[PDB]
């Protein structure tokens, strides 16, 4: 089932995180893992709307710094090993007909999707963003946004500062 | 979404059937030590050709973020502005632009982009 | 949460008729239907809105469905291929249920209404 | 404010990340606060004008993300496990948050990046992060209330503490030990009580804060220079130097005031044994302080021939030798401090 | 156990996030790639706390605005290293 | 002077600033017309909104149109 | 019932798969034909009855062309990119809106941000995995391109986000449905043009692939059937560009042929930009971007935000 | 002359075409109406529930000839 | 919530921060003990909040609650695997989709 075969590809992609020394390598397996991480959170969440929001920061663009000074690229490319693929298949298989096997509910979270909300909920029939984005900009904690953008400004003094070398 | 999931995976697996399949169906060729250059205009490639890493497309891209997340910041004001209170949503969004703008301005008089090297 | 000393209603309590109504039924006689029973609906599920524990809204919800069956059992009589052909416009038009496709099935439906 | 006004900025940004933490209510409004100050300090550190600076930065950086990271981290768990920030009871939740905390402060068992930062760091720049970046994880962890850990780090706070700065010639790595050992007196003040702890912290404050900000002035890195550095009368040179003394806090140095109202409410709190440890190794840190004050306390040494006349700033020199003399005779305004009732 | 079938995942990868940070690398950008997984994990145990909370949820963007200026700090440091010394490469530490 | 050399110099800037300024001074007759009205007993509410008779609420719901 | 649903779904998605790729592979010739009249040429008329099998006589040629592989071992990874790229290229169009339900994605907008922005890895590793100077400094070209425009490309997108009041696309139709939208926001559709011109890559923003400046930019170490999958994609990416730009500012007919009359309309516009549009230099671009568009866009947004609260002012 | 452009564009343009016309046909042949009833909300999703519990097509909608025929008092 | 020592106008950001009380079940829970916690002060009040931090932590923690399931479901898994439960028995009826 998705959300145990999802446990189960971070898994296997974690184990080939901890072996893999080439920085494209690396680099390539933060990036399976970003989209594994924003599918498993969305499931639990009550929409995707935080899911989309970080794919595109975390991944589509500072991604794009770790690969592109990672650009190093060792000189020469990757020698891959079709063995630790056979491993990661092996593990990724039998962890799967296991998590056939596991006990189909107790084995799942017990967050509560919009979907799992009661009938009742007169609060949850509004936009799924509405009401949960809502205290961000309504006061009295919509200040601390204001740090968060000067936080970036500020952010950016600081690297110009260090980016700034003598060139 | 595991409709979206299903799709975009029977769609790489066509994908790389396809791909798969075109790799049989070119003809081969014996391998040469020189069909497998890096193309240099016809002329021998130089030492590794590795670019130098100095530079500034890091800075860039680093502008990039900054506006990238501030861009997360502003996205929910199109749904809330109907739930919010108007005076706190409607400053508090505009001085966020306003800002924006001054950032921009004070750093054109700056200048940034017209570096030296 | 709950116990064996804990109080709940009975099997027959709860035993009561419903409507069996699909989505494009209940949507095609909303507005005339609203208007006829809201007494029932406000303090039936303003009991519900101040207080929360339904054991007691038992009651007034029974009243509820009755008075919706009540009026249906009118429409049923009185304009059943008006409403029918109403109830037909509004899923086959659109997969959004809106009532901006077949106003013209809804006039005629209010004209029998009217009339009846 | 060095040389240049990001200065300014910096240290400015830094305060309001720091008053965060302190202020802050929840866990994650302290952590929030603690990176803030990651960020402000990471600049400071960095000067782009020489090499050993950028290397303190890479570890400084690479050490304090961490802390923060676990920090963070382990709030979760307790204030998952907990469902509450005050949990019950101290259990295996929070003393990660402790060591998280002791971490970013640089206490006994976690500490070897902070003596090799003080070869990168120039005086104030060392200063700043010797006297402010230790509010915070501080004050935090007044709010951790486990017991043995604290007592571990006391422990350790000292005997490392003095052992190494017994061996260090580097002035820089000096100042690293003497107040690693410091710090042991804080953490044990705070185990018992918060109102002196913040008095402790305060006179370490004006004592560390005058003591390297007059090595700033005459830019004296190494004992050799202390006792090459000239002074037209060589009795400066010693009245001066008192202050070398004041670190151990001996009566007549003002530096006894705090040390004395730790150990008073210490040992009303009966952890007699504890006293005995810190205070034999305080021995320990005035030992080689007088290592340092053989420079100046016998007069008319062996010196460079070179020299003629020794400068310095106005401002700098105005403001360090006030706060000189009142490390010299401080002890009367004994009724001047209110604060201890 | 409720850790044991929910929070277990996270702390398993986190663990071993942190071991790779502690690890032989040629030089300090598996480290900075190390922790960078260690921050999604981070966000991970975050974001199922903040599902706890019917509202609270939007903290993500706090943490994440502030994760990702960490990065950029780390990558900063790192890029001017290479420039001072031509090289910022673990031999030269 | 600075006038037209900005509005040579700069045009897109000068017309999109003119364009800002216009926005704000309407946004706040947004605002002004917003609470001549008093704005928050909205004609339609979300939910299914409810009053018991005499709440200072149900005193004030709005008997107008729309 | 509800396995009715799923069926349908996928059926939906399969047969959009296969119309836009023999639509842009057959595409490809109007490209061909258009640009030669626009020049004085007369463009292919040969093969077939008139060139109309032009696009399939080129996907034949590919296939055959052997695969002239890169330094040893770059087998795989050489062999990864176009496929993670035309593969955001289609998957791209699940997104798009219909009335008669394909999805129920919300979002949309978001999703569009994601999949344009996911652009940069393919042609980054891309030019990686060739290893060769052109190769690479056409991909770090590309990639500042690509990534330079999206900022703007938010920004513009919320005017827009604003004015329809969700991120659900289909309300564009709604707000349509009595004057089209381009005549309120002519402005911005001459960026939103740019914009989408600078995504596909396309001229006068030709810097990734490119002639005359690199020889293809990363494209140049591709051989044939990896080359066929790039080509295809970016036509797959033009087009939907074409039909972003059609249910933004020109009704979102969805359900009216003049939509897909639109569709051509636009594409064209493509290439009649092709055919008479220099290119930028590096500099002038990155101007054009920061110090152009995004002052452009935040004015629109701050002018916008308070037509809104005008707007909700007023009801 | 230009109709020797119309072929290529008459091409795509039907292409194009092709799969909305595709959705309604096999919509309402193979399920009963043109439409899939769309689920964005939580209220159309709990009516689609409904729907879907009610009978297992939901677009095999039940009149109002599924009310009960009459009660005797 | 652990008390900022200093409380000064820099609390007024952070301390609203994210709240449990509003638009929660276990928000009645949080003002029944808070209140208390204010009464008490911290540390009297940690003592004295038994029931309050029982029901505040079992609202939103489910410790309690949501283990009693497990333990619930494992024995009947435990009777299958001594065989009680066979393949009609193992499972008890739906409730219907439109409950809860
Ligand atoms: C199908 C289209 C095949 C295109 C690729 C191709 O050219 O394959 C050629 C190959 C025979 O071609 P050829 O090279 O002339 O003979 C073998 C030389 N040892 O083709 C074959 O050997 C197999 C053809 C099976 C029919
Ligand atoms: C049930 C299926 C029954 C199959 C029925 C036959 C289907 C194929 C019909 C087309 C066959 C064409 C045969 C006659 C021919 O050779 O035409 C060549 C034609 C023109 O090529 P050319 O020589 O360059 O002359 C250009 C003139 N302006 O160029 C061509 O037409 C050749 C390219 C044809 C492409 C189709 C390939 C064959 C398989 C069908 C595709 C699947």
């Given at each position: 089932?998705?959300?145990?075969?999802?446990?189960?590809?971070?898994?296997?992609?974690?184990?080939?995180?901890?072996?893999?020394?080439?920085?494209?390598?690396?680099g390539?397996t933060?990036?399976?893992?970003?989209?594994?991480?924003?599918?498993?959170?969305?499931?639990?969440?009550?929409?995707?709307?935080?899911?989309y929001?970080?794919?595109?920061?975390?991944?589509?663009?500072?991604?794009?710094?770790?690969?592109?000074?990672?650009?190093?690229?060792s000189?020469?490319?990757?020698?891959?090993?079709?063995?630790?693929?056979?491993?990661?298949?092996?593990?990724?298989?039998?962890?799967?007909?296991?998590?056939?096997?596991?006990?189909?509910?107790?084995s799942?979270?017990?967050?509560?999707?919009?979907?799992?909300?009661?009938?009742?909920?007169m609060?949850?029939?509004?936009?799924?963003?509405?009401?949960?984005?809502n205290?961000?900009?309504?006061?009295?904690?919509?200040?601390?946004?204001?740090?968060?953008?000067?936080?970036?400004?500020?952010?950016?003094?600081?690297?110009?500062?260090?980016?700034?070398?003598?060139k | 979404?595991?409709?979206?999931?299903?799709?975009?995976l029977?769609?790489?697996?066509?994908?790389?059937?396809?791909?798969?399949?075109?790799?049989?169906?070119?003809?081969?060729?014996?391998?040469?030590?020189?069909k497998?250059?890096?193309?240099?205009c016809?002329?021998?490639?130089?030492?590794?050709?590795?670019?130098?890493?100095?530079?500034?497309?890091?800075?860039?891209?680093?502008?990039?973020?900054?506006?990238?997340?501030?861009?997360?910041?502003?996205?929910?004001?199109?749904?809330?502005?109907?739930?919010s209170?108007?005076?706190?949503?409607?400053?508090?969004?505009?001085?966020?632009?306003?800002?924006?703008?001054?950032?921009?301005?004070?750093?054109?008089?700056?200048?940034?982009?017209?570096?030296?090297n | 949460?709950?116990?064996?000393?804990?109080?709940?209603?009975?099997?027959?309590?709860?035993?009561?008729?419903?409507?069996?109504?699909?989505?494009?039924?209940?949507?095609?006689?909303?507005?005339?239907?609203?208007?006829?029973?809201?007494?029932?609906?406000?303090?039936?599920?303003?009991?519900?809105?101040?207080?929360?524990?339904?054991?007691?809204?038992?009651?007034?919800?029974?009243?509820?469905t009755?008075?919706?069956?009540?009026?249906?059992?009118?429409?049923?009589?009185?304009?059943?291929?008006?409403?029918?052909?109403?109830?037909?416009?509004?899923?086959?038009?659109?997969?959004?249920?809106?009532?901006?496709?077949?106003?013209?099935?809804?006039?005629?439906?209010?004209?029998?209404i009217?009339?009846? | 404010?060095?040389?240049?006004?990001?200065?300014?900025?910096?240290?400015?940004?830094?305060?309001?990340?720091?008053?965060?933490?302190?202020?802050?209510?929840?866990?994650?409004?302290?952590?929030?606060?603690?990176?803030?100050?990651?960020?402000?300090?990471?600049?400071?550190?960095?000067?782009?004008?020489?090499?050993?600076?950028?290397?303190?930065?890479?570890?400084?950086?690479?050490?304090?993300?961490?802390?923060?990271?676990?920090?963070?981290?382990?709030?979760?768990?307790?204030?998952?496990?907990?469902?509450?920030n005050?949990?019950?009871?101290?259990?295996?939740?929070?003393?990660?948050?402790?060591?998280?905390?002791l971490?970013?402060?640089?206490?006994?068992?976690?500490?070897?990046?902070?003596?090799?930062?003080?070869?990168?760091l120039?005086?104030?720049?060392?200063?700043?992060?010797?006297?402010?970046?230790?509010?915070?994880?501080?004050?935090?962890?007044?709010?951790?209330?486990?017991?043995?850990?604290?007592?571990?780090?006391?422990?350790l706070?000292?005997?490392?503490?003095?052992?190494?700065?017994?061996?260090?010639?580097?002035?820089?790595?000096?100042?690293?030990?003497?107040?690693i050992?410091?710090?042991?007196?804080?953490?044990?003040?705070?185990?018992?009580?918060?109102?002196?702890?913040?008095?402790?912290?305060?006179?370490?404050?004006?004592?560390?804060?005058?003591?390297?900000?007059?090595?700033?002035?005459?830019?004296?890195?190494?004992?050799?220079?202390?006792?090459?550095?000239?002074?037209?009368?060589?009795?400066?040179?010693?009245?001066?130097?008192?202050?070398?003394?004041?670190?151990?806090?001996?009566?007549?140095?003002?530096?006894?005031?705090?040390?004395?109202?730790?150990?008073?409410?210490?040992?009303?709190?009966?952890?007699?044994?504890?006293?005995?440890?810190?205070?034999?190794?305080?021995?320990?840190?005035?030992?080689?302080?007088?290592?340092?004050?053989?420079?100046?306390?016998?007069?008319?040494?062996?010196?460079?021939?070179?020299?003629?006349?020794?400068?310095?700033?106005?401002?700098?020199?105005?403001?360090?030798?006030?706060?000189?003399?009142?490390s010299?005779?401080?002890l009367?305004?004994?009724?001047?401090?209110?604060?201890?009732? | 156990?409720?850790?044991?079938?929910?929070?277990?995942?996270?702390?398993?990868?986190?663990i071993?996030?942190?071991?790779?940070?502690?690890?032989?690398?040629?030089?300090?950008?598996?480290m900075?790639?190390?922790?960078?997984?260690?921050?999604?994990?981070?966000?991970?145990?975050?974001?199922?706390?903040?599902?706890?909370?019917?509202?609270?949820?939007?903290?993500?963007?706090?943490?994440?605005?502030?994760?990702?200026?960490?990065?950029?700090?780390?990558?900063s440091?790192?890029?001017?290293?290479?420039?001072?010394?031509?090289?910022?490469?673990?031999?030269?530490? | 002077?600075?006038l037209?050399?900005?509005?040579?110099?700069?045009?897109?800037?000068?017309?999109?600033?003119?364009?800002?300024?216009?926005?704000?001074?309407?946004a706040?007759?947004?605002?002004?017309?917003?609470?001549?009205?008093?704005?928050?007993?909205?004609?339609?509410?979300?939910?299914?909104?409810?009053?018991?008779?005499?709440?200072?609420?149900?005193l004030?719901?709005?008997?107008?149109?729309? | 019932?509800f396995?009715?649903?799923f069926?349908?779904?996928?059926?939906?998605?399969?047969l959009?798969?296969?119309?836009?790729?023999?639509?842009?592979?057959?595409?490809?010739?109007?490209?061909?034909?258009?640009?030669?009249?626009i020049?004085?040429?007369?463009?292919?008329?040969?093969?077939?009855?008139?060139?109309?099998?032009?696009?399939?006589?080129?996907?034949?040629?590919?296939?055959?062309?052997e695969?002239?592989?890169?330094?040893?071992?770059?087998?795989?990874?050489?062999?990864?990119?176009?496929?993670?790229?035309?593969?955001?290229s289609?998957f791209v169009?699940?997104?798009?809106?219909?009335?008669?339900?394909?999805?129920?994605?919300?979002?949309?907008?978001?999703?569009?941000?994601?999949?344009?922005?996911?652009?940069?890895?393919?042609?980054?590793?891309?030019?990686?995995?060739?290893?060769?100077?052109?190769?690479?400094?056409?991909?770090?070209?590309?990639?500042?391109?690509?990534?330079?425009?999206?900022?703007?490309?938010?920004?513009?997108?919320?005017?827009?986000?604003?004015?329809?009041?969700s991120?659900?696309?289909?309300?564009?139709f709604?707000?349509?449905?009595?004057?089209?939208?381009?005549?309120?926001?002519?402005?911005?559709?001459?960026?939103?043009?740019?914009?989408?011109?600078?995504?596909?890559?396309?001229?006068?923003?030709?810097?990734?692939?490119?002639?005359?400046?690199?020889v293809?930019?990363?494209?140049?170490?591709?051989?044939?059937?990896?080359?066929?999958?790039?080509?295809?994609?970016?036509?797959?990416?033009?087009?939907?560009?074409?039909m972003?730009?059609?249910?933004?500012?020109?009704?979102?007919?969805?359900?009216n042929?003049?939509?897909?009359?639109?569709?051509?309309?636009?594409?064209?516009?493509?290439?009649?930009?092709?055919?008479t549009?220099?290119?930028?230099?590096?500099?002038?671009?990155?101007?054009?971007?920061?110090?152009?568009?995004?002052?452009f866009?935040?004015?629109?947004?701050?002018?916008?935000?308070?037509?809104?609260?005008?707007?909700?002012?007023?009801? | 002359?230009?109709?020797?452009?119309?072929?290529?564009?008459?091409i795509?343009?039907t292409?194009?075409?092709?799969?909305?016309?595709?959705?309604?046909?096999?919509?309402?042949?193979?399920?009963?109406?043109?439409?899939?009833?769309?689920?964005?909300?939580?209220?159309?999703?709990?009516?689609?529930?409904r729907?879907?519990?009610?009978?297992?097509?939901?677009?095999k909608?039940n009149?109002?000839?599924?009310?009960?025929?009459?009660?005797?008092? | 919530?652990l008390?900022?020592?200093?409380?000064?106008?820099?609390?007024?950001l952070?301390?609203?921060?994210?709240?449990?009380?509003?638009?929660?079940?276990?928000?009645?829970?949080?003002?029944?003990?808070?209140?208390?916690?204010?009464?008490?002060?911290?540390?009297?009040?940690?003592?004295?909040?038994?029931?309050?931090?029982?029901?505040?932590?079992?609202?939103?923690g489910?410790?309690?609650?949501?283990?009693?399931?497990?333990?619930?479901r494992?024995?009947?898994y435990?009777?299958?695997?001594?065989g009680?439960?066979?393949?009609?028995?193992?499972?008890?009826?739906?409730?219907?989709?439109?409950?809860?």
């Open positions: 089932m998705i959300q145990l075969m999802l446990y189960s590809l971070i898994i296997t992609t974690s184990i080939i995180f901890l072996n893999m020394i080439h920085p494209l390598a690396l390539l933060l990036l399976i893992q970003t989209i594994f991480v924003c599918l498993l959170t969305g499931l639990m969440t009550k929409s995707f709307w935080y899911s929001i970080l794919f595109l920061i975390f991944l589509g663009g500072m991604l794009v710094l770790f690969i592109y000074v990672t650009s190093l690229a000189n020469e490319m990757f020698n891959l090993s079709m063995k630790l693929t056979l491993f990661s298949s092996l593990i990724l298989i039998f962890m799967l007909i296991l998590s056939f096997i596991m006990d189909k509910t107790s799942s979270l017990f967050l509560m999707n919009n979907d799992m909300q009661s009938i009742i909920n609060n949850s029939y509004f936009m799924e963003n509405s009401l949960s984005l205290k961000l900009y309504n006061f009295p904690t919509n200040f601390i946004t204001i740090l968060l953008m000067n936080y970036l400004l500020i952010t950016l003094i600081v690297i110009v500062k260090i980016t700034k070398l003598f | 979404m595991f409709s979206i999931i299903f799709i975009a029977l769609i790489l697996l066509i994908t790389t059937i396809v791909m798969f399949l075109a790799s049989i169906l070119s003809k081969k060729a014996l391998i040469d030590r020189e497998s250059s890096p193309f240099e016809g002329f021998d490639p130089k030492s590794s050709s590795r670019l130098p890493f100095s530079l500034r497309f890091f800075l860039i891209t680093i502008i990039f973020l900054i506006f990238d997340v501030e861009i997360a910041l502003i996205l929910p004001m199109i749904i809330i502005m109907k739930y209170n108007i005076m706190i949503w409607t400053i508090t969004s505009i001085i966020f632009i306003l800002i924006l703008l001054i950032g921009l301005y004070h750093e054109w008089n700056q200048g940034m982009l017209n570096w030296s | 949460v709950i116990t064996n000393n804990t109080t709940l209603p009975e099997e027959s309590e709860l035993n009561v008729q419903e409507l069996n109504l699909s989505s494009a039924a209940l949507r095609a006689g909303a507005f005339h239907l609203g208007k006829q029973c809201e007494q029932a609906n406000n303090e039936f599920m303003l009991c519900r809105q101040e207080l929360d524990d339904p054991r007691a809204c038992l009651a007034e919800g029974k009243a509820v009755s008075c919706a069956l009540d009026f249906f059992r009118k429409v049923k009589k009185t304009c059943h291929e008006e409403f029918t052909q109403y109830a037909t416009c509004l899923d086959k038009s659109s997969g959004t249920m809106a009532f901006s496709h077949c106003r013209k099935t809804q006039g005629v439906f209010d004209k029998c009217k009339d009846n | 404010m060095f040389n240049n006004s990001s200065k300014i900025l910096f240290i400015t940004i830094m305060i309001i990340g720091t008053l965060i933490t302190v202020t802050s209510n929840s866990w994650l409004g302290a952590w929030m606060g603690l990176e803030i100050n990651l960020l402000s300090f990471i600049p400071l550190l960095s000067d782009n004008n020489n090499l050993m600076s950028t290397e303190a930065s890479l570890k400084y950086f690479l050490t304090q993300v961490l802390a923060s990271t676990v920090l963070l981290f382990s709030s979760i768990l307790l204030m998952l496990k907990n469902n509450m005050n949990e019950i009871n101290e259990s295996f939740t929070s003393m990660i948050i402790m060591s998280a905390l971490l970013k402060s640089g206490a006994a068992p976690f500490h070897f990046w902070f003596p090799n930062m003080m070869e990168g120039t005086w104030m720049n060392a200063l700043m992060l010797m006297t402010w970046q230790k509010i915070a994880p501080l004050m935090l962890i007044s709010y951790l209330n486990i017991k043995y850990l604290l007592l571990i780090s006391v422990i706070s000292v005997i490392i503490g003095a052992i190494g700065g017994l061996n260090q010639t580097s002035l820089r790595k000096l100042m690293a030990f003497s107040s050992n410091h710090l042991g007196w804080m953490l044990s003040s705070l185990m018992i009580s918060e109102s002196i702890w913040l008095i402790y912290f305060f006179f370490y404050s004006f004592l560390s804060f005058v003591l390297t900000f007059m090595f700033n002035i005459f830019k004296l890195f190494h004992l050799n220079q202390l006792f090459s550095w000239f002074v037209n009368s060589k009795i400066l040179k010693f009245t001066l130097f008192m202050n070398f003394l004041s670190l151990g806090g001996l009566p007549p140095f003002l530096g006894f005031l705090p040390k004395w109202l730790v150990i008073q409410q210490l040992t009303l709190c009966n952890q007699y044994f504890m006293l005995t440890l810190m205070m034999m190794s305080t021995l320990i840190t005035l030992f080689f302080y007088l290592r340092i004050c053989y420079s100046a306390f016998m007069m008319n040494y062996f010196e460079n021939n070179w020299i003629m006349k020794m400068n310095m700033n106005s401002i700098n020199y105005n403001m360090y030798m006030i706060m000189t003399f009142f010299i005779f401080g009367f305004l004994i009724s001047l401090f209110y604060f201890m009732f | 156990m409720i850790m044991i079938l929910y929070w277990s995942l996270p702390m398993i990868l986190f071993l996030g942190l071991f790779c940070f502690v690890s032989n690398r040629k030089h300090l950008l598996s900075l790639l190390s922790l960078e997984f260690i921050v999604l994990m981070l966000f991970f145990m975050l974001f199922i706390y903040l599902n706890m909370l019917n509202y609270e949820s939007y903290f993500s963007m706090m943490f994440l605005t502030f994760s990702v200026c960490e990065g950029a700090l780390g990558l440091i790192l890029v001017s290293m290479i420039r001072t010394h031509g090289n910022d490469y673990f031999q030269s530490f | 002077s600075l037209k050399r900005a509005w040579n110099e700069i045009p897109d800037i000068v017309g999109g600033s003119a364009l800002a300024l216009a926005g704000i001074v309407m706040t007759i947004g605002v002004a017309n917003y609470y001549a009205k008093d704005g928050d007993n909205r004609r339609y509410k979300l939910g299914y909104v409810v009053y018991r008779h005499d709440d200072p609420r149900a004030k719901v709005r008997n107008d149109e729309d | 019932m396995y009715m649903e069926i349908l779904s996928l059926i939906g998605s399969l959009l798969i296969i119309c836009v790729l023999v639509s842009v592979a057959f595409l490809t010739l109007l490209e061909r034909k258009v640009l030669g009249y020049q004085i040429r007369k463009g292919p008329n040969k093969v077939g009855l008139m060139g109309i099998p032009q696009p399939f006589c080129d996907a034949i040629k590919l296939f055959t062309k695969q002239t592989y890169p330094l040893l071992s770059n087998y795989l990874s050489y062999y990864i990119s176009p496929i993670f790229s035309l593969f955001l289609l169009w699940m997104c798009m809106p219909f009335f008669v339900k394909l999805y129920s994605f919300n979002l949309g907008g978001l999703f569009f941000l994601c999949c344009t922005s996911l652009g940069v890895y393919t042609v980054m590793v891309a030019g990686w995995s060739s290893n060769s100077n052109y190769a690479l400094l056409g991909g770090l070209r590309a990639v500042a391109q690509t990534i330079s425009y999206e900022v703007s490309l938010a920004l513009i997108l919320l005017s827009f986000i604003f004015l329809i009041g991120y659900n696309m289909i309300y564009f709604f707000y349509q449905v009595y004057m089209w939208f381009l005549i309120i926001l002519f402005p911005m559709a001459l960026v939103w043009v740019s914009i989408s011109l600078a995504e596909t890559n396309r001229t006068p923003f030709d810097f990734a692939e490119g002639e005359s400046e690199l293809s930019g990363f494209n140049v170490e591709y051989s044939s059937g990896g080359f066929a999958l790039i080509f295809m994609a970016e036509y797959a990416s033009i087009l939907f560009m074409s972003l730009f059609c249910v933004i500012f020109l009704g979102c007919d969805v359900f042929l003049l939509f897909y009359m639109k569709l051509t309309f636009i594409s064209f516009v493509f290439i009649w930009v092709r055919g549009l220099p290119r930028f230099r590096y500099d002038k671009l990155m101007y054009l971007a920061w110090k152009c568009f995004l002052s866009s935040l004015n629109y947004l701050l002018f916008f935000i308070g037509f809104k609260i005008l707007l909700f002012s007023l009801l | 002359m230009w109709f020797e452009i119309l072929p290529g564009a008459v795509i343009t292409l194009l075409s092709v799969p909305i016309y595709a959705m309604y046909g096999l919509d309402k042949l193979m399920i009963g109406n043109a439409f899939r009833r769309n689920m964005d909300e939580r209220f159309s999703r709990v009516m689609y529930q729907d879907f519990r009610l009978t297992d097509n939901p677009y909608m009149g109002l000839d599924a009310i009960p025929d009459e009660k005797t008092n | 919530s008390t900022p020592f200093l409380r000064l106008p820099l609390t007024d952070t301390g609203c921060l994210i709240n449990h009380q509003t638009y929660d079940k276990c928000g009645k829970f949080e003002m029944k003990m808070m209140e208390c916690f204010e009464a008490y002060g911290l540390e009297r009040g940690k003592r004295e909040c038994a029931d309050l931090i029982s029901d505040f932590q079992e609202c939103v489910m410790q309690k609650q949501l283990m009693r399931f497990h333990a619930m494992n024995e009947r435990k009777q299958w695997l001594k009680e439960r066979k393949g009609q028995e193992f499972f008890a009826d739906p409730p219907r989709v439109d409950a809860y």
